[PDB]
Amino acid sequence: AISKNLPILKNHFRKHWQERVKVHFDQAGKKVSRRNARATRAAKIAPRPLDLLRPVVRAPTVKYNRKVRAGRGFTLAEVKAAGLTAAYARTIGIAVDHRRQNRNQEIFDANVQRLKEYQSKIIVFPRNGKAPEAEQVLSAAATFPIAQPATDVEARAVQDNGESAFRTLRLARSEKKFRGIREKRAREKAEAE
Amino acid sequence: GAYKYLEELQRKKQSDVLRFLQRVRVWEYRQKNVIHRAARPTRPDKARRLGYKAKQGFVIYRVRVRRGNRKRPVPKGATYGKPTNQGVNELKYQRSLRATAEERVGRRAANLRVLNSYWVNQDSTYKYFEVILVDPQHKAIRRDARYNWICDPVHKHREARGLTATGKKSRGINKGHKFNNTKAGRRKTWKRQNTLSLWRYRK
Amino acid sequence: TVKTGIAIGLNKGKKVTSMTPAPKISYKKGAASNRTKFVRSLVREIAGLSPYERRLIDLIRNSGEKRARKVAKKRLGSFTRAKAKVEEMNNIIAASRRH
Amino acid sequence: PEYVRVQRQKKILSIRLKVPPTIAQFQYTLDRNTAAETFKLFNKYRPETAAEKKERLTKEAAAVAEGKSKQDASPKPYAVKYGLNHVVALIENKKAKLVLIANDVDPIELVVFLPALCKKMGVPYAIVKGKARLGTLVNQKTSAVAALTEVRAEDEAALAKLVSTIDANFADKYDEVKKHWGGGILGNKAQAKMDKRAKNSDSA
RNA sequence: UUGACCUCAAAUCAGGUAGGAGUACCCGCUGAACUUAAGCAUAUCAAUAAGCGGAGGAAAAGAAACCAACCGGGAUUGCCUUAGUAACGGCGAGUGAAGCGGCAAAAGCUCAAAUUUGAAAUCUGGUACCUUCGGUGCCCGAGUUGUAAUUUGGAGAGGG
């Protein structure tokens, strides 16, 4: 059970792992049926891509707020900023994420740019039938890449205000820290009897 | 409106005509029979907004259901095992008693497809319920995709599965971290979260 | 709201330009109505205070509101949701029969 | 058999039991006089149906698609009115000019808001007995939820006559049965024999 | 006297449908033991065996009473990932995640809540005929305890 220096290993195999198993022997296979759907989809879909219009939306957390992410649909605030309605914009080829909203104007911009380049490039035909075919471009998302909203510059001049930045955090943290107890003493000298 | 007068009404089941329905329908139940068929809605505000429509191919199943628990089958006071389980009359019933009724009228006439039941009278020996029946045979519902979906053999014995109100409820499957243990179909996520699946060039 | 720029503090982020949304009625979910208040008030007339209402109203006019606060506390469970039930009866007391 | 058993105890077991102020106001139904003229006067008010709907498409066949008649062609409907949600919302905005409250309705629950309505929205009503006799002169079934917001200038005379009769003999006796708890009427068994008990042990 | 009226039912029932099969895999319920702890009840085994209810090729999930704390994100599903960690457990043996990132694949919607009432106007069936998965002349009923028709939240409805 335990003899000679080795790491204490937790290997969850006390049950019937030897019953509910699945080595992907269908890796290359289901991977090929994948590329097949692509071409079978096309024959049907006529000149419309394997995916529709997806946005540039920054990612959450203290770890992913660093760079943007391939967003979901498209809010109706960014929908009318383009010039059309959702019950008609989706029937075109643009996603509509109505449960979500936009709280920043800097990114709302990079996202309203994605709605202009895409719409000015959509040769749409009515219920005519003749429809002057103009082929199509493989993937819709791989055709309008990550325009990573302004990374700013990478070469400026020196600027020193002498705050240390290290104490601007030793105190920035002391700010949110004694907020409640420094208001405790500020509660006494708050009410004048 | 009118129906919303009864929407707020079918809320204060505590006095006058409401507390008076306690001393009237309690005996109405213990009178007709136990598991039976009715005619028109008893509470139009509920049924309707929950799925009732006054048109052909429409019937109702008012049913008497017993309360309490489900004492572990095992004869006398024998459980054949370790105490972790032992207990008998002190045993739950993971599915709601409400399902008990549906699953009965539901399989008395499986020619129909169970839409949903509604509560109306709790006592001591029982807890009563009623049912809104969608008929996958009369052209009255078989001419309206407003609720046409019901007739399809993919809806075979609705109630006895969990596609009703009490259903998604009595499945533990709802959106949110309140259900991370099973936000997926019970054994789907179970088999999944334990299954050891390996690659081609094992990483 | 606005941030400070500092990576921590009252706001550990970026002072990047905010913006305003549309009237999401999913922030308006708490709505009443001339059709509903008509009914909610017409309710206290078609049925009015029930057995539980008579019971607790006499609990305030007993030893106070703190006492009637632990009665509706033994009916709903939310000490705070109970404070709601308290002032609602004083609305049946003062507002209806008091003036 | 079992169908007379359950139905007889149904309303008669409801009489031993003390009926709430929401009920009891019943039995206090329409007097035999109102029924007489409310049948001879409402026999001139019958809504569109059968030959009436057919005679409508022939008159617009010589008007609408003839001398271009915009929505209007024949005289606006002047008879009796119907509708649960129709006559229900009618009183909620004074639109009603006559109220006839639903006597029966197995579920007296969807007609509970009819009475307290005319209350804080004053409108003359009379709980009339005949959800069937109502359906006969309205060519419907058993609804008893009738309305009359207008009439002709040859019959509106006897209208205001019974308008005050129903109002006083029903609407003004209502503000009275507000604190009234009816029911509790026993039968000959526990009654005449209940006399032999209290009459042979008290002041005899 | 005549006729309604709701419930009940009635019948080689006009006239319609239901059982069951298979049962790797899935959706419920169900339910341990052996085993492990070097003994052993809690645990573990395993919300698995067997048990019993029901489909369909997938059925279930499925548009938020979600995630988050960020510049936020954004249906479900499944996938590498998180991580055998934070954590549950004689905190003993062992049990056991999610949201993020990456990902294929991606999609949307419908009923009650209103007073249309200048209009029961709609839906089941029968029936001559017909271009017959139905249709119009003829005739009933459900339904007025809301079928039409307006109405679904990201909205959108009466007035003008």
Add this chain to the structure above:
RNA sequence: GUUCUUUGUAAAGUGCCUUCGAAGAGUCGAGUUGUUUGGGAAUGCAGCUCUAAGUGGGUGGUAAAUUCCAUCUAAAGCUAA
């Protein structure tokens, strides 16, 4: 793709001001129980008791009280991959 025919005082979308905007209860959560269970002073689920509301209400993973907010709309429904 071509041919024989208007369902048309036809039907629906974004615009302006305005009056409005209902929004599902023996639920909700609370109580105690047992199972479940990473969910640990309830992870849901079920139990018998209790039975609301609308600047309200579910959530913000440590009980609880006050202060808003962040956050979303249950108690009704179809849906390929």
